[PDB]
Amino acid sequence: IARSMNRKFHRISLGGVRDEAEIRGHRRTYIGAMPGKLIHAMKQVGVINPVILLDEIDKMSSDWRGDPASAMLEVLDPEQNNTFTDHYLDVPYDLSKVFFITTANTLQTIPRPLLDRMEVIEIPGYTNMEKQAIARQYLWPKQVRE
Amino acid sequence: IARSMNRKFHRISLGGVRDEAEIRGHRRTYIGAMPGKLIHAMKQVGVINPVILLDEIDKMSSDWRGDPASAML
Amino acid sequence: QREYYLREQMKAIQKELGGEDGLSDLEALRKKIEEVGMPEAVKTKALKELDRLERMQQGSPEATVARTYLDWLT
Amino acid sequence: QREYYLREQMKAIQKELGGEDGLSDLEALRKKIEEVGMPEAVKTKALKELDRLERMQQGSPEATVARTYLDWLT
Amino acid sequence: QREYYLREQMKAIQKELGGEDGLSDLEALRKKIEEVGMPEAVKTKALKELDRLERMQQGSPEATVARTYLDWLTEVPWSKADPEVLDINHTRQVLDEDHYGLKDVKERILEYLAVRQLTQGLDVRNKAPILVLVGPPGVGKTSLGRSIARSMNRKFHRISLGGVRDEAEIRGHRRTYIGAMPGKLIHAMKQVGVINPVILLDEIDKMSSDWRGDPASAMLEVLDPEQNNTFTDHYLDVPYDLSKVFFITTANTLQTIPRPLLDRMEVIEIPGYTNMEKQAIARQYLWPKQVRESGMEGRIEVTDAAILRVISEYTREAGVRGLERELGKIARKGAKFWLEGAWEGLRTIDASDIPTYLGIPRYRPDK
Amino acid sequence: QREYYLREQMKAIQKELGGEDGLSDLEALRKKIEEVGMPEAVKTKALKELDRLERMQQGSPEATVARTYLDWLTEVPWSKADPEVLDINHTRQVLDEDHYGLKDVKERILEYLAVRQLTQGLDVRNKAPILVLVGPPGVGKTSLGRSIARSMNRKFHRISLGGVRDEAEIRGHRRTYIGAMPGKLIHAMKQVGVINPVILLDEIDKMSSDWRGDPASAMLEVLDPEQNNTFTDHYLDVPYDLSKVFFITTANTLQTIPRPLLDRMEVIEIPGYTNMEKQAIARQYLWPKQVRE
Ligand SMILES: Nc1ncnc2c1ncn2[C@@H]1O[C@H](COP(=O)(O)OP(=O)(O)OP(O)(O)=S)[C@@H](O)[C@H]1O
Ligand SMILES: Nc1ncnc2c1ncn2[C@@H]1O[C@H](COP(=O)(O)OP(=O)(O)OP(O)(O)=S)[C@@H](O)[C@H]1O
DSSP states (O other): OTTTTTOOEEOOOTTSOSSHHHHSOOOTTSSSOOOOHHHHHHHTOSOSSSEEEETTTTSOOOOSSOOTTHHHHHHHSTTGGGGBOOTTTOSOBOOSSOEEEEOOSOSTTSOSGGGGTOOOOOOOOOOHHHHHHHIIIIIHHHHHHO | OHHHHTOOEEEEEOSSOOSGGGTSOOOTTSTTOOOOHHHHHHHHSOSSOOEEEEETSTTOOOOSSOOHHHHTO | OHHHHHHHHHHHHHHHHTOSOOOSSHHHHHHHHHHSOOOHHHHHHHHHHHHHHHSSOSOOHHHHHHHHHHHHHO | OHHHHHHHHHHHHHHHSOSSOGGGOSSSTTSHHHHSOOOHHHHHHHHTTTHHHHTOOSOOTTHHHHHHHHHHHO | OHHHHHHHHHHHHHHHHHHHSSSSSHHHHHHHTSSTTOOHHHHHHHHTTOOOOOOTTSOOTTTHHHHHHHHHHHHSOOSOOOOOOOOSHHHHHHHTTTOSOOHHHHHHHHHHHHHHHHOOSSSSSSOOOOEEEEOOBTBOSHHHHHHHHHHTTOOEEEEEOSSOOOGGGTSBOOTTSSSOOBOHHHHHHHHSSSSSOEEEEEOTTOOOOOSSOOTHHHHHHHSOTTTGGGBOOSSOOSOBOOSSOEEEEEESOSSSSOTTTTTSOOEEEOOOOOHHHHHHHIIIIIHHHHHHTTTOTTTEEEOSHHHHHHHHHHOOOSSSHHHHHHHHHHHHHHHHHHHTOOOSSOEEEOTTSHHHHHOSOOSOOOO | OHHHHHHHHHHHHHHHHTSSSSSSHHHHHHHHHSSSOOOHHHHHHHHHHHHHHHTOOSOOHHHHHHHHHHHHHTTSOSSOOOOOOOOTTHHHHHHHHHOSOOHHHHHHHHHHHHTTTOOOSSSOOOOOOEEEEEOOTTSOSHHHHHHHHHHTTOOOEEEOOSSOOOTTSSSOOOTTSSSOOOOHHHHHHHHSSSSSOOEEEEESSSOOOSSSOOOGGGGTTTSOTTGGGSBOOSSSOSOBOOSSOOEEEEESOGGGSOHHHHTTSEEEEOOOOOHHHHHHHIIIIIHHHHHHO
């Protein structure tokens, strides 16, 4: 979808933070300046259009303090994201040219309000004929020429 | 109702809560604590008089950890 | 002699350039306290924690907890 | 003109206190303000990261955290 | 005021000294920071520090940490390695005189040497996976670390984890503090002289977490070969490259290893040893060491039925330490019997003369 | 004569430093470094640490931290022998005084001392045992440690690990902190003067294992039958040698000890006592003491 729409592609997904405060940034009051994870993906691109894939959103990063809901609800809703603010950003940031991709395996651990925006794309599996065709076309030249 | 009264609207979706620490806070003596859902809603509304919808207060996961129904009292 | 003099020449430059503002985050927090609200006991609690942040330094890990406490209060 | 002249004598301290100096500084991210972006509010915060930064040119325990935040912001 | 004057006297003497002895060491580091190895950005950060303030006797807190950072930056190895191995049959000549058995690990080493030799394209010299050894306690893991490092004839250093719960032993602290403390990796790289060593990371099962998180995020930052090419520190301010370093990690189970580390892993299950394998290692490695330390060399000898008695009736483990101590007890009992009156030649221990030396057989034999 | 003038000016420097403190006990530190034999990497590391510490005085606090580093490093013993007195009838009669019965452990000490006569100069490894004593609470185990350490004319030290969930008691905090301090074990080696002591780790089956507060996995670098020639604490940045140490640990139940620690240690079980044993223990150990007191 990135190369068809002439866009970039970045991964960065759930499982790398301790709370949604680490989904956001951290203020300069600390010594260890932990940036917002999002902005760090935006730093490595010189384009504010492309997609951002959310691999394994059901594999959360929760704790007894903080569920991964509020920092996700303020970036997935198409309303409050137009003026976005991190603790390591503290300025009006704009999310209207991006088109996010979310990847999951099970909808059951996803909370109820964040299902307001999700659109269900499911996977049928693969036939052994389909896997034989995949392994001829697409896996054998990579793993052999590597 | 929010439009007819001309006030702010907000939605808290309960049913997923499991302890009293997601309705109240925890304590300041635990690293990184925060207050509960009602304080989140008051943070995200702007006035003293919004309306707050409470979806599925009848399905709150009161369990071996605690009972947030008493926290709701 | 030149060291002590010329760094004062540096601060000369700065005291003309910056001037007069009183612009930081601390008295901004105090102003944000004194604008909205407040009930009386809540106000005195916030002023105690504000002074507890004021006369000392910036960097201790309990000051981060008190900072998050005041930021959740405002 | 007053800008030119105050920065004249500031970088006269630079070539004067010439190790190395100045951090040759804050004449220079002045060009990536309008180049990299920017809206007005980022300009309000980061132009209040020029001269009260210029207050000294040593260390710092402040210049590293403000360095990371500002060079993140630019 | 008197102290300020006499400190003037002292530092006057010093600047004649920094003429007299105080040339040709910082000058010699300015040579050696511009000698072979250093990248261009590292040369720029080396040119950053050239404005000195010259008060190195009466203090100074801003004079000694810059010298410390300069020494740490100039002592880590920059672009130097002992050459590649040419014969992979000789790799089998070396790996087989340390361990009986362990086919799979030797095969993976030979495969990695064959792939590194035969590739002249790309996509595998950059991406070579990290071995994760998993096995029950008692099988050989650390001795494999030494045997692999001597097999390829590379240098070696071993980092033990498990007592580490702080992040600043993998990363370090900021260089503006009092104690200049880079992480364990900068120590492990200045120990070896080459830029391509073998590093054994002991016990990634046991990195406990605490406040300010766990150092498992730093482990993600070091055990993924797509960002450690630009691996920077909190102490160092240059991008170092931990790409070619052949990491080997040991473990006892995979659950307590974090899931951000089970993406750039490659598990190898060591199932345990069997009775013939234990008997072969028992002879050819455990017995002459357990007799050479005990001083009873050429005065006592164990048979091969007797090792089978010791294995089947005096140890139940998936490893070889219980067998090691059970042989050591025989060596000590013989060393005690020698002082009560010597014999001639060497007494030989058949499988029936064990319980004189080892008491009651604990585990019944399977009949 | 000009270097005489020059380092004489430095004599005057330390005359104003503390009357001392610039080449007085700094050079006493050079003596005690080139006293008792350190390994050469550790020795040159201590020499460059002394070289970075030498030419400053009285500030900064980094001078104080490095002074305490060279006070720890040059006082923990390096090559401080304990003379193995090799009589096996004297030591048998000394072990027979403090305890009755206990045939297994006394036979073990006689075996592990009869071996140490027949050391054929070099070519041996000289590795000390690592015992674990397992028994019910009343049976004398902690009493036996000082008895064994006195019979062999060695030294003795205790470490109680009774309820520690505190990691970095075993290892230390790294020296960049404020109140930095080594572990329990390097301090236990510091108080003893020799490198052949008898360390009694008291309650090793009562510790903690949790996602925060797991000290039992930090006992891997210590109770190590091969690789404890490379022990790495966090305060000292050098490998310290713990092979010569006659460790004795006690426990109560094997069911609560971690699996990478049972195989590091050598189990010796103590099977309570019987009525004849208790009666003899009573008559010649318990009743005279309770009559005296
Ligand atoms: N097949 C073998 N050949 C030779 N020596 C062996 C063999 N298997 C084990 N050993 C020896 O047995 C001892 C076990 O070494 P380690 O690998 O440290 O044991 P370990 O199981 O790794 O301990 P942990 O707790 O899992 S780190 C060493 O002395 C090895 O040399
Ligand atoms: N066989 C014995 N002969 C003489 N005194 C003994 C004997 N067995 C035990 N004692 C004495 O009984 C007491 C037992 O003390 P401890 O050694 O502390 O017992 P302990 O079992 O080590 O305690 P715990 O619960 O195991 S830590 C001491 O006063 C010993 O001297």
